[PDB]
Curated annotation (Swiss-Prot):
Miscellaneous note of the record: Present with 1620 molecules/cell in log phase SD medium.
Effect of disrupting the coding gene: Decreased sensitivity to the cytotoxic effects of 6-azauracil.
Protein family: Belongs to the SNF2/RAD54 helicase family.
Subunit comment: Component of the 1.8 MDa SAGA complex, which consists of at least of TRA1, CHD1, SPT7, TAF5, ADA3, SGF73, SPT20/ADA5, SPT8, TAF12, TAF6, HFI1/ADA1, UBP8, GCN5, ADA2, SPT3, SGF29, TAF10, TAF9, SGF11 and SUS1. TAF5, TAF6, TAF9, TAF19, TAF12 and ADA1 seem to be present in 2 copies. SAGA is built of 5 distinct domains with specialized functions. Domain I (containing TRA1) probably represents the activator interaction surface.
Subcellular location: Nucleus
Gene: CHD1
Function: ATP-dependent chromatin-remodeling factor which functions as substrate recognition component of the transcription regulatory histone acetylation (HAT) complexes SAGA and SLIK. It recognizes H3K4me. SAGA is involved in RNA polymerase II-dependent transcriptional regulation of approximately 10% of yeast genes. At the promoters, SAGA is required for recruitment of the basal transcription machinery.
Entry note about domains: The 2 chromodomains are involved in the binding to the histone H3 methyllysine at position 4 (H3K4me3).
Protein name listed in UniProt: Chromo domain-containing protein 1
Organism: Saccharomyces cerevisiae (strain ATCC 204508 / S288c)
DNA sequence: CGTTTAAGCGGTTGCTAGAGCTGTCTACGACCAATTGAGCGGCCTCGGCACCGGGATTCTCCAGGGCGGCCGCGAAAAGGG
């Protein structure tokens, strides 16, 4: 969730390199993957269409 | 003061309620004219309460009739010269 408080807590960190460990990248909709790749690549990926 | 527990915070996941906006239309209420009947005042009359005259009803008082007690009075029986 992009609006969850952990997203703004972690996205404001001054970090050069990030990495996400999970087992289920897609759960409900493409917006979850869009939020994950925006946390990874800020502004490079522009997934908007459902 | 020791211990447990539930509030607080963050999180999911979908649907529904509700605010906001735009659009249409239709029944509903404002408005006006003519009308009239329900509200306010007075006027008249009866129901009931009350006042006055007349008649029927019961209680109190004054007088007559009869009986008891006194007032010496008077005829009569017994005693004395």
């Amino acid at each position: 969730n992009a609006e969850s408080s952990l997203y703004e807590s972690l996205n404001s960190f001054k970090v050069a390199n990030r990495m996400l460990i999970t087992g289920t990248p897609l759960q409900n909709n493409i917006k979850e993957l869009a939020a994950l790749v925006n946390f990874l690549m800020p502004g490079r990926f522009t997934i908007d269409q459902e």
